[PDB]
Amino acid sequence: VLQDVFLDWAKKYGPVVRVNVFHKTSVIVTSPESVKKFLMSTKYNKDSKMYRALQTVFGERLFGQGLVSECNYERWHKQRRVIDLAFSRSSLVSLMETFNEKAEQLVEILEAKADGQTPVSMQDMLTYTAMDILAKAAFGMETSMLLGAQKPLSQAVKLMLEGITASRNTLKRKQLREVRESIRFLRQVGRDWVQRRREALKRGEEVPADILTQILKAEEGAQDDEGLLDNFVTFFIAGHETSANHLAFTVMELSRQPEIVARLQAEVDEVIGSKRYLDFEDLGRLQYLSQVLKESLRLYPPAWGTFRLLEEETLIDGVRVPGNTPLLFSTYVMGRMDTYFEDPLTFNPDRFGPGAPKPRFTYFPFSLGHRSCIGQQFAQMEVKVVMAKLLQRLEFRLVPGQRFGLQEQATLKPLDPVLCTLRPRG
Template identity: 55%
Template sequence: MEVLGNLGVLFLLLLAALLLAFGIYCGYVLWVHAKYDHIPSAPRESFLLGHLPIFWRMMKKKEFVHDLFLQWSEKYGPILRFNALHRVSVMILSPEGVKEFLMSPQYPKDRLVYDGISSIFGERFLGTSLVTDCNYDRWHKQRKIMDPAFSRTYLIGLMETFNEKAEELMEKLEEKADGKKEFSMMTMMSRLTLDVIAKIAFGLELNTLNDDQTPFPHAVTMIMKGMTEMRIPFVQYMPGKQKMIKEVQESVRLLRRVGKECLKQRREAMQNGKEATLDILTQILKGDVLKEIRDDENILDNFIAFFVAGHETTANQLSFTVMALAQHPEILERLRAEVDEVIGAKRDIDYEDLGKLKYLSQVLKESLRLYPPAAGTVRWTGIENVIDGIRIPANTTLMFSTYIMGRMEQYFKDPLTFDPDRFSEEAPKPYYSYFPFSLGPRSCIGQVFAQMEAKVAMAKLVQRFDIQLVPGQSFKILDNGTLRPLDGVMCTLKPRSLPKDFQM
């Protein structure tokens, strides 16, 4: 009896301690709320969980949460607060705020957010790559190593590969171009950009356009799915998720294994005096003066970052662009007239041709405005700021969305209308309200590369084929780590009548 009595006392003491801890935590949450409650926001559904139940319901239904943020911005203004337990994040949809926080190196990426994708389900993923490194000085050293591989001289030399791989895509599309066969344009674009980044960045010939059995497209798809699923708390403990988690882990291990083998072969070639091509991998290995960041794990981090981001975002951009053009035949015809004038009957596109394809540039920019594959970015401020008259406390996570700002009436007239003339030379330039590749020192290193690749692929596609969308598609957007067309852009194609002097 005495033992039972002692256990009862112990239980009561433990319960009292837990209640005290919970009370203290609630007091802390209340104190945090007091610092941020002056910032506009939709009503919280829960004192502790804040807005999380709203987001969780939408994720479960596969609804597009970015459109909810857009609605909130229209109702509550361009500075919004989001509560989640004891954390409060602030979304900045103001050009003044975008300029202040993205253009300056004093506001780093938020470690809590980017550390979350340094590994996936326990497997090292992006580690301390250019994408995830929140230490500005260390990131800057990595960026200096990479910059020469994205110089204008190097990019001009890529035209042969861009043409070669885009031509392989055209050949695959010709097999489908009977006006009846339905296929996913997103799948085809994803395989194209995967082949391009593998060859240009790492000297790998994946040949995913011609090999349906290659594991790489599926691996990347599973990794992006894993990034999305990780947003759900305790997802790794949920029944029914273990198969998906195992596939994601195996996919990450596959890419790191391939990267390790690629790294080994390149080192051996360089040691044997073989002339190395100026690609991303070579640039990393040549950075001998910066050995402190050249450990193999960091090299593999960057291998995966370029491998995944270097094809996923461009594939999605191309898919959205095809979707938009097929919905607007008058814009497609105007683009085709430019392509016919600049490219004519040529098979291969020259670097000089890209600068002449001005309307194509406008089309691609407008596609990125309405459908940016990377919806936005995140920063951290350690100091208090005032933006649009609203005080932002120090030590706050800041969220920025080019998707939302691109659809706000105060920044773009008739924002839901697809209108490439917004980006004509005569049109007013968007003032810190358009940043599909981010802005400032942490902007995407591969943006020129990506747009050259996109131009070559789109010019050839428009030159060769008439595009029809399969009826019944929703044209909704899926957030799968990046934004992509939910239905995959299902198409049918017919070959255009090409001139007799078409140069094969």
């Protein structure tokens, strides 16, 4: 992938290197001290130019000015102020139900295929699980992709994601219209779930706190609904894709880590035993699993980095960088430099063991500072629940011909689906 070229240039030409990314010039900055300086201060904001591709795709508005793609500070802070309420500790705890139900359903489906002969794309299975979780937790709606439903919506998402791949890269005639079809499809599903929400509150019906309630609340006194559909599509996608890929990477890696798996099984037996559903307080004690996930994100971060606009010419690590320059920061790159991580190609979860110094601005799969992931705790919870349940009940072997490796898409994800054969534990 393109991130592997940047790593080579980082290693070779040091901490400040001009590059071309999405066919625009920027400076990739790879010192911890630089990361800290620019990420940990609100003085630095995202670069409209770099995110302008995510805002609109092929003349069809995708994330628009939603929580990811909005770069002006004050406009972003206004939404983030209110959307933040849907991610409080009590908000989160109440989602353990959605996470558990979906996790259980996933494990059950796979148990039905656990003959040890039936190939299953774990990438697909984990995408359906993540979307099912997101759709319900965020919007109070059931997609049931895990049981074959909403196969059109699943297809819209797929095409739209290739869309972003070609929009900001790729330098036939039908494939470009299907992407536009897909983007408008997602916006219309948005309208319906927004409408089906308004109708239920027009019947004065009781509806618990949501991401949906919060996005609506942020869009009050808006002449259009566009700022609301922006945030619908942003969360619909951001709230499932990176989690899906993170899961896929982890199961991929694990299929060739028998010792790690054993310890994982060993751990999950002690904390939950055979209990069907996990309580909020259970996740905290899945400490080794926590470590595996953290290491998974170090080698395989779905969201490989972020951009900040450097407005005034500044001196960065002894290099003069000119004003109006986009800064690229890459957790993928830093995670693979032996300057910051001994023997960096080795998947070693002990790196995050208790007592190890926490990596110091050399590792940020959820980014850092104010533009960090609003969904961090959300995804860390959901990912422990799925992984806990998989480890509890099933074993996965990777089908011969399945490659370990990456593709760059809208996010980093396994090049291959994660085709596996499955057995019951024991």
